[PDB]
Each structure stands twice: as C-alpha cells, then as structure tokens.
Amino acid sequence: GAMGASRLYTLVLVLQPQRVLLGMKKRGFGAGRWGGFGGKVQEGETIEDGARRELQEESGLTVALHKVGQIVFEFVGEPELMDVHVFCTDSIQGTPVESDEMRPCWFQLDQIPFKDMWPDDSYWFPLLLQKKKFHGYFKFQGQDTILDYTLREV
Numbered sequence: 001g002a003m004g005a006s007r008l009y010t011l012v013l014v015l016q017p018q019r020v021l022l023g024m025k026k027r028g029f030g031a032g033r034w035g036g037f038g039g040k041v042q043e044g045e046t047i048e049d050g051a052r053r054e055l056q057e058e059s060g061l062t063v064a065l066h067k068v069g070q071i072v073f074e075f076v077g078e079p080e081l082m083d084v085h086v087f088c089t090d091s092i093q094g095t096p097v098e099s100d101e102m103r104p105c106w107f108q109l110d111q112i113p114f115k116d117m118w119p120d121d122s123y124w125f126p127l128l129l130q131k132k133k134f135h136g137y138f139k140f141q142g143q144d145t146i147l148d149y150t151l152r153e154v
C-alpha cells in the first residue's frame, strides 16, 4: 500500500576540520544518545529556518547551513515516518550551552562516539564526514535493532 505519512524534521551537525559538536539527549525518546541538534519543522516554516531555530533552541548557537542528506526513519508499531533533513555548518561565532533538551560536548573526529549514538550513524555519518550527499532509510524495532535499511550517495 501507500508509503506511510511522514513528519518533517531537521538535524544540524556543527562540523569543523578536527572536531564535531554533539548533544546528549537528556530525556524522552532516545535519551542517553549523542547526536546533532534538531526537531520538528513548524507550520509555515522553511526547512532551513527550522534547522536554524532548532540549533539555536537546543545549543544556543546562531549561524549559512549546507544541505548534506536526508534520512527516513520507520519504527515497528508506528505508522508515521520521520523525514529528517540533515544540514551542516563549519562556521560558528558563539558558545554552545546546555539546554533542557541537550548537553553539548565536542568530539575529535578520531573519537566519534558511535557506541553512544543511534545505530544508523555507523552507515551515514562517515559519508557526512567525507562531504558526500546521501539519502537513507532505516526501519527499527525499538531503539537498537535495524530490520532493514537502504542508503545511497547522491
């Protein structure tokens, strides 16, 4: 039948030559995992404006964003998909702050904390680091198990 309906999300990676800024999600779904900053796009908002807003709300940073990929997530037992538009920037001009949602830390690019990131990151995060654009899809059973995935460079 028809592909499930999807909700629009953004995800922003602050990626400098030697390090990346990640946030530890403090509560809710996926709490305890490190990742980029993002959330739901709001009604009438452009995707890039939503990405800037989520970066500011979750990390305090105000920034040019570059579109780097799109990843669709499906969870067993939930008919609605997450359609995540991924962005990255190298240029910041303020300091990240802990928010209600996220605790920030910088990681060197030889210390990407995959053990404490979502399992899908092993597949697409390396493409982001190589500046290669991508489209991916991941079906999860719960928070740990991937039952199916597709990934391509574009």
Ligand SMILES: Nc1nc2ncccc2[nH]1
Pocket (backbone or CB within 6 Å): 030, 035, 073, 118, 120, 121
């Ligand atoms: N990398 C990544 N972030 C996620 N957030 C929520 C669900 C699945 C996710 N995979």
